[PDB]
Amino acid sequence: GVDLGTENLYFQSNAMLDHLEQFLPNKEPSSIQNFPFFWISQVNGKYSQLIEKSIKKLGIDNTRRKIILSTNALGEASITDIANLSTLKLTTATKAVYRLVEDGIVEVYSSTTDERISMVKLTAKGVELVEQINQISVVTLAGILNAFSEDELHNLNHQLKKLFDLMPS
Amino acid sequence: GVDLGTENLYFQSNAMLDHLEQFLPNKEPSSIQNFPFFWISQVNGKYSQLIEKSIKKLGIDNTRRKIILSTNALGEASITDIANLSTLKLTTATKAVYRLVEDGIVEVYSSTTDERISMVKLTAKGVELVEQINQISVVTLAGILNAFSEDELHNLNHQLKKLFDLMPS
Ligand SMILES: O=C(O)Cc1c[nH]c2ccccc12
Ligand SMILES: O=C(O)Cc1c[nH]c2ccccc12
Ligand code: NI
Ligand code: NI
């Protein structure tokens, strides 16, 4: 029984349920490998270990790495926005931003449009560390992503986006 | 400079680097949305919030949920194997298994082939909670995954697997 945004409760078609059972973990030892979120979780976890392990050298962690690349891409950003893009809790994000200010990697500054919003931007040191991050990326990633065509990867991004956009909160 | 498993260091072709730069976060505000791991991370995080939030009712968390569905699919499993499949640290896994024994959801038992290996299996209560997990899955997931064809989803699983298999440790 779902509500689909209403004051009533709806029991979905046995069709929707059959299709969904083609993908759900069940009593069969290989059900799990049909589940797209299983694979998203497994890929995220194996990737997370790889990147943490190799970004080691630069004496930062992947939390700081994402903050820096989000600031880089955006130029100036909402700590909020950086957190969002970096898949972080706002508290985790704020904590790591100040750790990067303390290291002289980013400048934080009151937003000109609205003093409350803390904007973030790189320092000269921030920018050199970006190229270092990009080079460690080259090393660890070039083989993996050169194993796919431009078509496969753009398609995969599209499907991941479609998934991301159907989920709510 | 990479080693590719040898005693020498190799500088990859400017080709591999150009292709890789089609996908990496860079100074362009939309570089990030070309990056497959960005999307894997974002989907994993949005999914994680959704499932934790809705598995709430059953008074378990998604860590326990995955343990139960891995035990379910396998019948009897290595706590090791359950941890692996559930994308958990072995310590996290062992901790949650005993929490589920304490709740009478799983039986733990010395492996018949090798007494050290702790095997896990469901209880009658475990099995009823499986169908409850499957029904909460129906509610929260049926819409999202009925938004894709069988072809799109099997393809997406395949590409995620290919990624998972090229990464190492
Ligand atoms: O969190 C999820 O739903 C995905 C997932 C990762 N490992 C799993 C093991 C069993 C069932 C689902 C999953
Ligand atoms: O962890 C990753 O590499 C993926 C990712 C998630 N959010 C990001 C923001 C900027 C750059 C990469 C990422
Ligand atoms: Ni997960
Ligand atoms: Ni990540």
Cα–Cα dist B32/B34, whole Å: 5
Does residue B65 line the site of ligand 1, with CB under 6 A? no
Considering its fold, how many domains does chain A have in total? 1
Cα–Cα dist A154/A156, whole Å: 5
Q: Are B129 and B65 contacting, i.e. CB atoms less than 8 angstroms apart?
A: no
Four-CA torsion A55, A61, A63, A69, nearest 10 degrees: -40
Helices B36-55/B124-146 angle, 10° precision: 130
CATH of residue B66 = 1.10.10.10
Q: Which stretches of chain B are assigned E, i.e. beta strand? A: 77-78, 106-110, 118-122
Domain for residue B7, yes or no? Answer: no
Report strand pairing: B106-110 vs A118-122.
Answer: unpaired
CB contact B158 to A (< 8 Å): no
Residue contact A46–B164, C-beta within 8 A: yes
What distances in angstroms separate CA A147 from CA A153, B3, B87, one per listed residue?
10, 18, 24
Percent of residues in chain B assigned helix, strand, coil, to nearest 5? 60, 10, 30
Contacts of B33 (CB under 8 A, 6+ apart): A157, A161, B39
Q: Are B85 and B66 contacting, i.e. CB atoms less than 8 angstroms apart?
A: yes
Domain for residue A3, yes or no? Answer: no
Cα–Cα dist B148/A52, whole Å: 33
Domain for residue B6, yes or no? Answer: no
Nearest CA among A94, A67, A147, A120 for reference residue B164: A147
3-state SS, residue B40: helix
Domain limits for position A28: 14-166
Report strand pairing: B106-110 vs B77-78.
Answer: unpaired
Which residues on chain A are in Cβ contact (under 8 Å) with B160?
Answer: 36, 39-40, 42-43
Domain for residue B4, yes or no? Answer: no
Four-CA torsion B141, B84, A34, B159, nearest 10 degrees: 100
Domain for residue A156, yes or no? Answer: yes
Domain for residue A63, yes or no? Answer: yes
Which residues on chain A are in Cβ contact (under 8 Å) with B67?
Answer: none
Nearest CA among A96, A98, A95, A71 for reference residue A82: A71
Nearest CA among A162, A157, A31 for reference residue B147: A162
Domain for residue A24, yes or no? Answer: yes
Which of B44, B47, B87, B130 has most ligand 1 atoms within 8 Å of its beta carbon, as the pocket-test mutant? B87
Domain for residue A1, yes or no? Answer: no
